[PDB]
Amino acid sequence: IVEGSDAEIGMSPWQVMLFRKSPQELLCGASLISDRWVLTAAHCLLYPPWDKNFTENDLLVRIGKHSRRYERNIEKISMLEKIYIHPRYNWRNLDRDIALMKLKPVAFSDYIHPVCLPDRTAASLLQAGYKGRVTGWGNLKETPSVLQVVNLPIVERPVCKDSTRIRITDNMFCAGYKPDEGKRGDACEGDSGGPFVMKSPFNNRWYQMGIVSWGEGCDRDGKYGFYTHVFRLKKWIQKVI
């Protein structure tokens, strides 16, 4: 994450990191939405132009981690039972870039806790200017030891569309500071799949509003990061769960 900061211990209990069995390598980030389901970005498992096609038997997850240091008696490993990519995943603008990985149930802890999925919250929290939080162990620059967090304000549809040449669909949204906003920050490579959360001032709960999908460069003036609009795809998630 560019211009981010160190996450405190137990700041994101739903934070999950996706690993590949062999070669054992960190692929993406993900969120724990329940004791047996993990949410991640579609391109983390499937992306044809890069001969990328992973399945439940080629991956594994690790929950409750702060540093990339064996957090003894805290972190938990798990194998996937099945994977589910959205039937209409347009990998040829990453439209509907979302997937669900089914785990045996993980034991909750002070460091392992599920995030809430948005409810018709969405209508209130999804407004330009409102800030959300991004987390990940991705690249600090375009070209870390511990988890990174960065609060970013959501940008309005027109600004998002004007900042790129990729056909922006309604199943996504951009976020980030404008070139004259003062502050900087943005997700980057490796942060793919990471959660975009917001704290509901109504019931004091954290809701995952989006998923890290794509972005031109990292923290470039004029550019903003695009996240999967979770709420809109909730129907699918509900059906497959």
Binding site: M11, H113, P114, C116, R133, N204, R205
Partner: peptide, 27 residues
């Protein structure tokens, strides 16, 4: 059904450093 409620924070009536920023953005 206690999703979103972080044990080390919400459950313990505690808040993280950058948490307030988000709430202030909600106005």
């Amino acid at each position: 059904a206690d999703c979103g409620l972080r044990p080390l924070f919400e459950k313990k009536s505690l808040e993280d450093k950058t948490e307030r920023e988000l709430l202030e953005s909600y106005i």
